[PDB]
Design a protein around this ligand. Sequence first.
Ligand SMILES: [Mg+2]
Lengths: 111, 244, 244, 195, 232, 240, 242, 241, 249
Amino acid sequence: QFNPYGDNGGTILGIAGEDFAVLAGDTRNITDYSINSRYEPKVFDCGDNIVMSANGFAADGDALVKRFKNSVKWYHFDHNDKKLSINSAARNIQHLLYGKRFFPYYVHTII
Amino acid sequence: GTGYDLSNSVFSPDGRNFQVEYAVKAVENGTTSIGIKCNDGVVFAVEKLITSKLLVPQKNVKIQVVDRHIGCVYSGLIPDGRHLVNRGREEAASFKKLYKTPIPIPAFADRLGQYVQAHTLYNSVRPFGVSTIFGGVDKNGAHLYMLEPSGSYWGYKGAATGKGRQSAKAELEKLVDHHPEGLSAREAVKQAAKIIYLAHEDNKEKDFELEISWCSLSETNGLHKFVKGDLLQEAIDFAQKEIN
Amino acid sequence: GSRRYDSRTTIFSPEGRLYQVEYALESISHAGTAIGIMASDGIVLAAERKVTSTLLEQDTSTEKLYKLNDKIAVAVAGLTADAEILINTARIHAQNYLKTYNEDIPVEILVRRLSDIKQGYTQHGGLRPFGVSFIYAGYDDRYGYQLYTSNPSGNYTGWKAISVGANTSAAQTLLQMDYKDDMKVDDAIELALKTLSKTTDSSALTYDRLEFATIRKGDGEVYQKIFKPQEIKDILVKTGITKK
Amino acid sequence: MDIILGIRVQDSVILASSKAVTRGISVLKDSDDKTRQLSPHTLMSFAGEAGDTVQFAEYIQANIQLYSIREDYELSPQAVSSFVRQELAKSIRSRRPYQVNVLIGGYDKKKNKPELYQIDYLGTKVELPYGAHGYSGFYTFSLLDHHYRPDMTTEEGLDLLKLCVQELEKRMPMDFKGVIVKIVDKDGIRQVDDF
Amino acid sequence: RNNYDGDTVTFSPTGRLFQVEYALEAIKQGSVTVGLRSNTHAVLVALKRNADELSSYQKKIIKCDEHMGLSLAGLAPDARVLSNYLRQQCNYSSLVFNRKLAVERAGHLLCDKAQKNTQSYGGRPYGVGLLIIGYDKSGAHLLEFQPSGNVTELYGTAIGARSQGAKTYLERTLDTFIKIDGNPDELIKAGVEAISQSLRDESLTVDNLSIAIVGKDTPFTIYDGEAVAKYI
Amino acid sequence: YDRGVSTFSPEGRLFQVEYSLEAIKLGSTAIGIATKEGVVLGVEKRATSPLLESDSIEKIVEIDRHIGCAMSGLTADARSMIEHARTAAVTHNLYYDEDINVESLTQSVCDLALRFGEGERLMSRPFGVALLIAGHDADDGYQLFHAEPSGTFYRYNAKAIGSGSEGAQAELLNEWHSSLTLKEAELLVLKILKQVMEEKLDENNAQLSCITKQDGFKIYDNEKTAELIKELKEKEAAES
Amino acid sequence: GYDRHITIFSPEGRLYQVEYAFKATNQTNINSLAVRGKDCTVVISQKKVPDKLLDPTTVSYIFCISRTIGMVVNGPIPDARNAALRAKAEAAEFRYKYGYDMPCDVLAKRMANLSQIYTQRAYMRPLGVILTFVSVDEELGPSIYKTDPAGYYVGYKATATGPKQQEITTNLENHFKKSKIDHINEESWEKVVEFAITHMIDALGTEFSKNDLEVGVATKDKFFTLSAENIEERLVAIAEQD
Amino acid sequence: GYDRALSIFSPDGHIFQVEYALEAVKRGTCAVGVKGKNCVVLGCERRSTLKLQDTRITPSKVSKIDSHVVLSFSGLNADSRILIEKARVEAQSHRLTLEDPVTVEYLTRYVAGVQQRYTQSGGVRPFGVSTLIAGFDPRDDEPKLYQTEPSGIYSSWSAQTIGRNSKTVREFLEKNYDRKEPPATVEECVKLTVRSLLEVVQTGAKNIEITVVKPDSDIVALSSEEINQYVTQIEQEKQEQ
Amino acid sequence: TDRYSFSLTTFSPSGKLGQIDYALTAVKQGVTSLGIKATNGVVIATEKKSSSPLAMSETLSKVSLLTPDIGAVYSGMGPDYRVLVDKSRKVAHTSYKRIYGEYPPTKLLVSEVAKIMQEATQSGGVRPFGVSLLIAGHDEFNGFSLYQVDPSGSYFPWKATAIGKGSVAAKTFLEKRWNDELELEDAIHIALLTLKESVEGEFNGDTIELAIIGDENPDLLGYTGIPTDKGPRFRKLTSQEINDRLEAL
Ligand SMILES: [Mg+2]
C-alpha cells in the first residue's frame, strides 16, 4: 500500500513583540534517520510584510506555501493592490487548509 | 433558388460549398508563401509585409514547426493558421505517444485534412481561411503537401499560395521543367528567396521581409530549422542579384 | 448558424397566444368527433373513426378509445401516435402511483400529470406540441365518476358532457339541449349515439365507423367495457339508427 | 435503545415513545417527543440512529403535507405507510441508508377504522394489532399476546400500555425516562397528559 | 443590406469577417493609448476616458505579472476577461515551471484565445485592442493585439481614436527613443509626447493620464494621479 | 430576432447592450451624491395606482452593512445581481475577515453583466437594469459607482440614472462641489427628484438612504424624508 | 425557401441537398468502372493531373480499406478521404468485434446507413461521394457494391460511375448481353484489367497512357493497386490485341 | 439542448415576449383581491357556456399554497399550475428548513423570481400568468395582498385586479376603496369584491367565485348560495335608481 | 456540433404537419407494394424496380424478415426503410425477446416501429421517415395480422391494402376481390394479379418480390430436437416459385 505522507523533521517557532515579530526555523531536512539537506529553508517571505512556515511533510508544506503566495498575488490582483492584513491572511489560510479537510496537509503552520 | 452562400456546409444546386470558396477568396488576399521539394528535403519561404518600420525585424515569425521534423507555412488568416498548427501538433503528439515513431508526413497531412474537412460539414462552424504548405523528411524521404480550405490536400513538387501565387507558381513550374533531377537544399533555399522576391511584385506597395526555413536530410539531419545568418543573407543576395 | 431554420415553436403572439397551440387545435378540429357523457350511474365514451375503409379490419383496430388502467379510459382526437406516446406515459404514471401508495390513482391526478406533460412542450424545449385532445372517463372513490378534457395547451377541465374533434360546436349544442342531470347510463348511450349521428360527416352512422366504451358499476366494483363491433352494431340497432 | 410502542384498539391507535435522548454516558434529554404528525389523522413514531430519525421523519412529513395541500385530500394511513415503506426500501440500497424504524398510526375516515403499521429500516411493513420496535418488542409482544383484546376501548388500551411500560421499566436495563403517549382516532391526534 | 454580418461563422463573398471588423471598429471608438520601448524599458501611456466631468477616468492599464502588463482600447469587460486569461497563463508558467512567461508566448496564447471566438457559432470576437509590454529573458517587448487574432511585436504603436498621430510620431521618433537605455523618465516623456500627438481639442491632466513602466531592474509599475504630475 | 444576442453593430456596439440601456432609460429615477461625510442615494418610487402600497417599492437595497445599492429599469432583473453581490460580500468577509472593497463588489457584479449569450449555460439576454452602488471602505473612502449591463462600471462624485437622468446630470454638474456636506447632498437629491418627478414630491413617492462610515447603510424612514422635504420647501421658498 | 438548404422534405417530397450532393459527386469529372472476373475484381478510374507541380503518386481516388476490400470514390477528395478513413475504421472494428474480415457488402451497408443518417439529421450535410467497394469475399466471390449520398447501396455484376457513366454502363450491358454471363470468363486478373481498360477506351472514345489510369485489383485475400509500369504493361498487351 | 434566446430586447428597449405574456394575461378571466380590516377576499370570474361544465371537479382559480396563503391568477391555467406546484414545494421546503411557514411576501418573491428567471433563460418563454397572492404571516393579523407580473415584478396592494377588463375593476376599486376606512367586517369586504366582479361579469353569481382568508390559517371559499345572497343584495340596492 | 435541438416538423396555420404530408408525398411516389391477409397466412409483395440491369436483383431485397413470424415491405425511400428494419429487429430483442423469451406479437412490434417514426416527426433536427410500411405477422394469441405504418407514426390493421403509386388502383382491385374465406394460395394469386397492373416492365420472379407469413417451416429451422421450437412462419418466395405461380394465369 502507498503511504501518501512522510515526515521531514524540522522545527519552527514564532514570537510576537511590541512592534515586531520573528519566525525562525531550522534549515535541516531529513527522511527517517538520514539527512536530506543541511540547508533547506522552510520560513518564507510571502509579501505584504508576512512571513510563513508550514513544517511537517515537506511536500505538503511547499504546496501550502505556494498556494498562499498565489493567494496573496491574486488578492493584489483583485483588490487594487490592497495590503493583505495578518488576520486576513490567517483566515485565507484557514480556508486553504480546510479545503483538504479529508486529505489534510500534514503540516503545522505559523505565520 | 438562392441563399446558398449564407450558411456553411450547404450544397448549392451546382454541388458547391460557397462558404469554402469565400474562405479561398480570403486566402488569396493573404501574403505569398511557397514550398519547394528538393532531392532530400523541403524548403519553405514566406513574405512578411512590413507595414511600418515600427515592426521589430526578424520577429513576428510566420513559419511554424510541428514535432521536430514538420514545417508549416500558411497564407490567409494567420490566426486560423495558428489554430490548424496547434491541432496538428496535438495530432503529432498523440501519434508519437501511441506508435513511438514521429508521425509520417502523409499521416500528418491526413490528420490536418480530416480536421479542415470536418470544419466544412456543419453550419455551426466556419471553414478555415488559410492555405497551408507543409512537409518534411520521414523514413520514406522528403514530402511536400498543400492543403486548401476545402480540406483537399495534395503532394507537390512545389506549392505556392497567397497574392503572388500566380507568378510564383509559374516560376516554380519552370524549376520543375528546368531540373527534373532535383535541386539541392541550398539551391532550393536560394531559389525560394528568388521566388519570394519575384512574387512580391503583386504586393509591391509595401516593403517586405523574407523568411525561409528548411528540412533537409543532409543539411539539417532531418530536423526543421530556420534559414538564418549567413545562408539567409546569401539567399537574399541571390534574389536581389536576380532582380537586377 | 442553425437558428435561421428554427420555427420557434414556444413563443407568444402579439395577442398573447401560442401559435403552435392554436394550429394544433385547428389540426384537432379535423379529427373524428369524440363524445363523453357522465350519467348518474356511469360514463360513456363514443367516437367516430375518421380513418375508415371496406378493407380495414375493425376487430383488431383501436384508434380512438384506450385503456389507461382498469378504471380510466381516454378518447383521443388528433394525431394517434402522439396520443399513444402520451397514453404510455399516463399508464406508467398510474402504475407508479399504484406502486407508491398501493391505491388506484385518482382520475384528476392522472389528468393533471398528463396535462403538465403537454404544457411542458409549449413553454420550453423548442419542439412542436402534441396534436392530441383527450377525454378522460374515470372512477375513483374520492369524486366518483369523472369526465375531463385536455387540449395541447395543457389545460384540462371537467364536464358533465363534452365533445372534442370535428363539429364540436354542433355536438356541444345538441348535448346542452338534450342532457339532464338525473339521466342513467343507457340514456347517455342513446344521447351520445344520437349526437354522433347528427354531427357526422358521413352519410349514415354505421357500427364499423364507431368506437364505444362504458365505465359502469355492472358487482360491487366498476367495470370498463370497450365495445366490440358486434356490440356496437347491436346498440345501434337498439336505438333505431340501423335496421336488421 | 429507544422504545417505540403501538397498540391499535377498537376505535383508535395509541403510540408510546420513550422520552430519553442519550449520547455517550449522558442522558441529554428526558422530554423528547419521538413523533411527527404526518396528517391530521396520521401520526408516526420513529427510532434509530441519531439524526437519521428526525431527518427521515420530517422529510416524510414534508411530502405528506405537500400531498395534502396539492390534492386537498388527506392520504389514507395505508397509502402513507406504503409511501414510507417505498422510501425506506429505496434508502436501504443507497450510499447512506436511513437507519430508522417507524410506527405509523392512523384513523382511516373512509373505512372508519384504526390502522397501525410497523416498518423497519429495510422497508419491511406489516399491519399489526400491536407493534413494537427494537428490544422492547422482546418484552411487549408476549404481554400483549396475553392481554390484548380486539374490542378494547381506548382506556383499556391505555391501561394495557401502562402495563407494558411498567414491564419495560422493570426488566429493560436502560432508563428511557418514561414515555409520551398519543391517541389517534376519528377526532384527530391528542396527547395523554400524564403517564 | 448586408447578409454576411450576422455572425462570425459567415465569410463574405469578398472573403471578409464583418463581425471581426465591427470589433475593430469598437476599438477605433475606444480611447487612445500608446506603447513604446527601448532596449532596457517599455512604457504604456493611457488617456483614460471619462463619462463626464463628475465621472472617474476609467482604469486603462492592467497588470498581468511582475514582468508584464497591458493597456486596453475598446470593451473594458473583454479586456478584463483577456487580462485574466493572461494572468492565469503567467501564473501557470511561474507555478509549474518556475519560469517567467515569455512575452512572445503570451501574445501567441492571446491570439489563440481570440481566434477561438472567430470560428464558432454563438459568441463574438472581443471588442478590445491590447498593448502588451514586458521585460523577459529576451529583453524589452511591446505587442499589439487585435480581435482578428493578429499579434505583432513592435518598438512602438498606438490604438484608439486618432491613434495615427502618435503612430506617425513614433515612426519619426523611432531612432530617438530606441536608444534611450537606462533613463525611464525620457521614455515616459517620449510616450507622453506621442499620446499628445494623437489628441485633438484636449490636454493631458493628472486625472486622465495613466503611465506604466517595466524594464531591466524595474518591475511592472503603474503611475496614476500625482505620480504622473511630473509629466504635465 | 434576425441576428444574435452577442452580435456587433457595424459601429462597434452590442445590439442587446444598447437596447438594454434604452430600456433602462424608461425606469424610475435614481440619483446618488458622494461627499466626504457620506454618500446619499434617492429614488423615485413611482406608484402605478393609489391602491399600490408605496412601502413595498424597494428600489434601494443593502448589499452589505457598508454598501448600499439603488436600481433603475427592469428592477426584476436586478434581484439576481443583488443576490450575487450579497453573497460576494459575505463570502469575502468569510474568506478574509474583512469588508469587501466597493470597487471589488462592483467588479464582481459587473462580471455577471456580459455573462449572456448562447452557450457553459448563460442568461439569454443582458440585464435591463442599472445600479448605483454606494459604499465606504478604508482604502478609497466613500465611493459611488454606476454599473451598466454592458459590464462596464464607472465611479462618480454624483450620478443620475433612469428617466429624467440626462437633465439631472447637468444639474448635478452645476450644484456639486468637492466640499459638499451630507445634509446638502440629501437636500440636493430631493430637489432634483422633485424637478424630474411627474408629480408633486412627497415622502410616499420618493425614498432616501445614505452610507456613512459611522452608522453604515441606512434607509431613511418616511418621517425623516418628509422633514427633509419640508426643509427643502423652506429653503427654496426663500429665493428669488 | 429554407427546405433547399437542410435535409428536410420539399413540398414535392424531395431532399434537394441530397440531389446537390449527387451533383457534387461529378465535380472531379472523373469516370470509373468495376468488373468481376472468374476469381478477381478490377476497378479502373481516370487519373487527371492538371498541375505539373503535383506529385502524381499522391493523386489517387482508390483506397485500400482492408487487406481484402478496396474502395474507389467518385467525388471531391476531402469527402473521399473522410469516407475512406471511416471505412477503414469500421473494417478494423468489425474484425476486432466479430473475429473475421468485414464482408464487402456489410461495409457498403454500413456506409449507406451513415449516408442515410446524414440525409435524415439536419446538423450533418451529406457527403458528395459515390463509393464503389470491390473485394473477393470468401462467401460471395468477386463482389462490387456501390453506395451513394442518398443512403442507397446495391451490388453489381459490373458498374460504372461518373459523367460518362451511362455510356460505360451501356457498353458493359451490351458485352454481357453478348457473352450471356455475368462476369469476365478469364482466369488471370491481368486479362480482366485489360478487358476493363479496353472497354473504357471504347466507351470514352479516348486512348490512355500509363499516367492516365488507376487500376485496383482485388483477389482472394488481397487487394492491391497497379503501378504506372504495370499499367503500361497492360496497355502494351492491349495494343498488341486485335 | 434548446437554448435559443426567446426573450430578447427590441431597439425601443422592450422584451416583446414578456409584453406578449402580459397580453395573454389580459385575455384571461378576471381576478380581484381586496384587503379588509382583518381579512383578504379573492374573487374570480368564470368563463361562460358552463352549462355542461362540471363545477364539482373543475379546478378553481384560487389554489391554496399553504394552510395560511392562497394564490389566484389570470392568464394560461397550465403555466399557473406549474407556478403553484413550485410555490407549494417551496412553502414545504421553507417549513422544513426554517421551522416557520412562509410569509406572504417571501412566497410572492419566490414566485416572482421564478417568473423573472423564465424571462431571462434561453430556450424558454415567460409565463402567460399574473398572480394575486393573499394571506396572513404566521402569528400575525395584518392582511397581506401581493401581485406578480410575468416580468418578475411584485408589489403589495390594498386592492388589485388582473385579467380581462381589469382596468374597469381597478378604476372602480380606486373610486370605492378608502385606505382610511378599509372594510371592517368580512361581510363588507366580500360585498365590495362581489360588486367589483359584477361590474364586469354582467351575468350573475354562477360565474363568480369568492374565497375569504382570515388569520390563523382560516381559509374558506363561499358556495354559490352565499355568492347569490351577495348578488341579490347588490341588485336590490341597485333597483332603487 | 449539433445545434438543431428544435422541431423541423411544426403545425402550419391550416393545422397540417407539413413534413409529414411531404413524407406521405414521397411515399405515394414510391413503387407499389401490397399486402393481403388470408385465413391461413398473409402475403406481402412489391416490385423490384432496378435502375441498371447490371445491378444484382437479389441484393435489392424489399421484403425483410423482422422476427421468425413477422416480415415487412415498404413504399418510399429505400434507405429509410432499411434503417427502420434494423431498428425494428433490434427493438424486437431489446424490448421483448430479452424480457419474455419470445418474439413480440405483430401489434407490439408495429407499435414500436410507429413510436420510432413518431419520434422522427417531433424530435429536434430530423425529418420524418419517407416510407410507409406493410408489416405482416402471426402470433399465437392474435393469429395473423397485417398492419400499415405511415410517416406520421400512425398504424392501422388491414384485411388487405396497398401503398405507393398504383395504391388507389390496387385498393379498388383488392376491395372487389377480397373475402374472409380466402386461402393463402388464393391470396398469392390475387397479389400477383394486383401487382401485374402496377408494373410496366417485365413481370417474372426476378422483377417481383413476394413473401408469406404462413405455416411453420421446420426445414427452415436449422436444428432438430426441440418439439416445441417451431419453424419460422416468414418465408420469402423464390423466383422459381413465383414463375411457377405466374405461368398459370
Ligand atoms: Mg442534413
